């Protein structure tokens, strides 16, 4: 198996960290984890889209 992102679920920027809640391909919601942005830099455009969308939804 590999670390395959199926869907970005949520995002928080607190505690000196930028974290994304991710849904893993081949796994269920019981396996959702929060991962640092540094470790997801290979999906930079997916993260950028989620950053803008969650910024507009919060506003």
């Amino acid at each position, epitope marked *: 198996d590999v670390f395959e992102v199926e869907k970005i679920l949520d995002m928080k920027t607190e505690g000196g960290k930028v974290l994304y809640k991710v849904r893993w391909k081949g796994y269920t919601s019981d396996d959702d984890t929060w991962e640092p942005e540094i*470790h997801l830099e*290979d999906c930079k455009e997916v993260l950028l889209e989620f950053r803008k969308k969650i910024a507009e939804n919060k506003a």
Partner: nanobody
Amino acid sequence: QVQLQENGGGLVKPGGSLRLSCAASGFTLSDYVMTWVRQAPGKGPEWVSRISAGGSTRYVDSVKGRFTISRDNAKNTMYLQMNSLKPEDTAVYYCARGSTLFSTNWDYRGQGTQVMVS
């Protein structure tokens, strides 16, 4: 300074068990993607299991259902529980500190510990 030291190896009969540890200092394990790697004599390096900063784990297919990776955040130590060991599991096992979920590339690795199944 960043340090990684492995232990727990040794000689074990086929079907036995070993619990490897990877003690870290100079950094926090939960801030990195940690990987167990092994290299048998005469073969190339191959990753065995990884644990994400968030605690998500994945195993190579040849060890699925036999190996279990975990980390004690209060110890800053990573563990690799090896059950139902086979002669093909003979290798030097070493932990590696990565920062990418999609590559196993690392910056720091330990010196490794020997596992001999015989």
